[PDB]
Write a protein that binds this ligand. Structure first.
Ligand SMILES: [Mg+2]
Ligand SMILES: [Mg+2]
Ligand SMILES: [Mg+2]
Ligand SMILES: [Mg+2]
Ligand SMILES: [Mg+2]
Ligand SMILES: [Mg+2]
Ligand SMILES: [Mg+2]
Ligand SMILES: [Zn+2]
Lengths: 135, 114, 69
RNA sequence: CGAUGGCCUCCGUUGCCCUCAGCCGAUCGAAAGGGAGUCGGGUUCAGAUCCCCGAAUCCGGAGUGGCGGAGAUGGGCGCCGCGAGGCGUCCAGUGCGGUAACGCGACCGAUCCCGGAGAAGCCGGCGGGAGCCCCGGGGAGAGUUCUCUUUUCUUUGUGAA
RNA sequence: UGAGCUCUCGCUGGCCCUUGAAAAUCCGGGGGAGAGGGUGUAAAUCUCGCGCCGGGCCGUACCCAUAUCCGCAGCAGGUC
RNA sequence: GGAUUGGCUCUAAGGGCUGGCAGCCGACUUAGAACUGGUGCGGACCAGGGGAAUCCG
RNA sequence: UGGCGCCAAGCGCCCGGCCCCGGGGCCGGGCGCGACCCGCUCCGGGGACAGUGCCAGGU
């Protein structure tokens, strides 16, 4: 049946954020009034962490392993789904469709997404999600 | 009718000696020499015949004085490749990577059976 | 040439060190204030009259003023 | 690595070592090919996009960069303060918006690599925009008026950026 | 007001056993080697706005044609 | 190889804009008719003589 | 399948400087596998003929 769930990893296909990897946080397969097309709110990473390695100090390690995230609602036609998924928890109250009516709490949503992405990336799990797509 | 003459010393209708009529405040018709028409950059795809959007179509040395945003569009490969070809490239890269992964896993399975 | 459309930035450019002189043109239905800077000539156009001659004393004292008769 | 000057700060000047790497071949060859960027008014006996007046514009340069604006100024916790607002710890901050085409005043980045513009024949048809011509009037000045002619003729504007 | 004339911009088609320049110069992108600061007087850095200084050398008059050119000439010729 | 062609006065057909219709604008054409001139009308200018055959290319 | 690919990852062995308590921490370097070893023509293709120099005959 339907495969594009609220835990999927999606390759964003258009817009300023093109070629980035995001995670769907809330899908809507039936268009709402303001958006007749089916869509989904996702959280992605804009600046991937740099290729860290040994033989460098952990101050440099921390400086390089820093993520810049974005939160956006996308049309389904501009999203390419994958077979991967990440179980990273995102707070629904902070990250929701109401975040776009002001620029104050959108910064909070991006902050929370960035913090969660960093603490998950530091563990080394889902490492594919944190490497840029070479295209 | 006032027949009018050239203003430079080039008396031939070459590609650089192109003019247009204008009415000066002195109520006279004079030649103004026009710059050649620029072209918007062509896509790096090599297939799409149209020219890129969002980029000013001026002569190459005029690009030196334009601002950065007037010469490109804020997207990956923006200002040099069209959006359709960017999407196709993205899909192609991801799909070939997946194909390689599944081929490698099938090879590993075959080796395990062997 | 550059047109200034709101009142105060005209005085802001008038008080710049670069500004050389301001000339006042008084035609019918318009009053034009032309301040000559290094790069551009800034023109401020006032439709009514009372704003014009209550601004006429608002220019900096050290800036030359020339009424076009 | 070695030396100098400048408040020897930080940088400049070199001299040596390490490291980095192709050239399509020195050079010449177009006053019609390519080639950034100046227009209007006035002026002489003879010169004007060149002189004067007035509006611009391109390229190059600047120890201290001259200055604004952007990078930028947020969140959490313990607090004070009724609050406003103000303290002490942590954490982020190489911009932001639009589903998208893309937009916004800027929005770090080297060697290297890819691409674009420069950079393209002849002919046909059609459409848009100017200049000119044309028609009906308002003015201003001239011509005919033996008869007629609300008549005939001239003129009736705005540069670059 | 006009299938009016000229110029220019654009769309579209036809023809080729013809396919109809190069370089100087300039720009965008991919990458991500480096640099900045520890919360501030913020720093590195800005293709944004304004401000400061300079642009050297050579040609420039006139004829351009039944009289300023070439034909021995103020030549019914020739000359883009 | 034939006919016509001037001048003048008409008629008919060929369209746009606004609110099967109504109103308001309009650009050149084409055809037909009457009248008329000392049969003259592409009145100046511009502007193919024709046909039947042979030789050669 | 009209994508990307360089300027090492990793591993091993040494060294320096700073700090803290011989050990640890912090910063910054060197070498070697990764990328096997040895060799006498850069690889191929011809070759004592092509070819060249000088004589002789024909044309
Ligand atoms: Mg030329
Ligand atoms: Mg040369
Ligand atoms: Mg030349
Ligand atoms: Mg004009
Ligand atoms: Mg001359
Ligand atoms: Mg015969
Ligand atoms: Mg012949
Ligand atoms: Zn394309």
């Amino acid at each position: 049946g339907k495969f594009m769930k609220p835990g999927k990893v999606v390759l964003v296909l258009a817009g300023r954020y093109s070629g980035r990897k995001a995670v769907i946080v809330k899908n809507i397969d039936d268009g709402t009034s303001d958006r007749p097309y089916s869509h989904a709110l996702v959280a992605g990473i804009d600046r991937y962490p740099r290729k860290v390695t040994a033989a460098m100090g952990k101050k440099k390690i921390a400086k390089r392993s820093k993520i810049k995230s974005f939160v956006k609602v996308y049309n389904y036609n501009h999203l390419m789904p994958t077979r991967y998924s990440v179980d990273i928890p995102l707070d629904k109250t902070v990250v929701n469709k109401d975040v776009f009516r002001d620029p104050a709490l959108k910064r909070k949503a991006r902050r929370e997404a960035k913090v969660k992405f960093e603490e998950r990336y530091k563990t080394g799990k889902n490492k594919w999600f944190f490497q840029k797509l070479r295209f | 009718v006032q027949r009018l003459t050239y203003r430079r010393r080039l008396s031939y209708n070459t590609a650089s000696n192109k003019t247009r009529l204008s009415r000066t405040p002195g109520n006279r018709i004079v030649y103004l020499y026009t710059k050649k028409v620029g072209k918007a950059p062509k896509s790096a795809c090599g297939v799409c015949p149209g020219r890129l959007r969002g980029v000013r179509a001026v002569r190459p040395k005029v690009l030196m004085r334009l601002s950065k945003t007037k010469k490109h569009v804020s997207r990956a490969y923006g200002g040099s490749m069209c959006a359709k070809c960017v999407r196709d490239r993205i899909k192609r890269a991801f799909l070939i990577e997946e194909q390689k992964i599944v081929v490698k896993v099938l090879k590993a399975q075959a080796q395990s059976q062997k | 040439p550059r047109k200034i459309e709101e009142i105060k930035d005209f005085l802001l450019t008038a008080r710049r060190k670069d500004a050389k002189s301001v000339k006042i043109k008084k035609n019918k239905d318009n009053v034009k204030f032309k301040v000559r800077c290094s790069r551009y000539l800034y023109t401020l156009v006032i439709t009514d009259k009372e704003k014009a001659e209550k601004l006429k004393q608002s220019l900096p004292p050290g800036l030359a003023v020339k009424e076009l008769k």
